[PDB]
């Protein structure tokens, strides 16, 4: 074959997380499955900035710290679109036509990522500075 047959390759309980994440999933539209990614990566990214920052013990640490978290995401949706210009030159048609093989929804992935990538970010700033 091509791959190897261990006793734990292609095991069910890890495939249940694999084929149900919002990037390998079945029916989600590429505007929406980029939201669940952007809601995911955004909420924790304001973790490291607010307890490990240049100023941590001020008014002032969660507020400024969380500007850099949305300030990181805007460099990521940039890096998503430069991947869109360079991998999808016209979204050249390929073997699967996923969101990922052939593009077709990439700036709907990109715009979907930025919604939670600002939305989930300040939600933790709500949950950290208040509550």
């Amino acid at each position: 074959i091509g791959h190897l047959s261990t006793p734990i390759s292609n095991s069910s309980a890890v495939n249940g997380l694999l084929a149900n994440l919002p990037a390998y999933r079945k029916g989600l539209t590429p505007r929406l499955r980029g939201l669940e990614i952007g809601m995911a990566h955004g909420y924790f990214l304001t973790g490291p900035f607010v307890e490990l920052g240049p100023l941590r013990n001020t008014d002032g640490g969660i507020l400024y710290g969380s500007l850099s978290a949305v300030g990181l995401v805007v460099i990521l949706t940039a890096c998503l679109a430069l991947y869109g210009k360079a991998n999808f030159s016209g979204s050249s048609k390929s073997k699967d036509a996923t969101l990922w093989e052939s593009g077709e929804g990439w700036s709907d992935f990109v715009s979907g990522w930025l919604i939670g990538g600002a939305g989930s970010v300040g939600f933790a700033y709500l949950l950290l500075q208040y509550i």
Partner: peptide, 30 residues
């Protein structure tokens, strides 16, 4: 104050644009 405003523009924000459009020129095919 230019010293407090220009150096993120030309240290980060203008390098964010040119190194984008450099990379954008590179992978392009006819």
């Amino acid at each position: 104050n230019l010293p407090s405003i220009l150096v993120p523009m030309v240290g980060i924000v203008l390098p964010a644009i040119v190194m984008a459009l450099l990379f954008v020129y590179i992978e392009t095919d006819e």
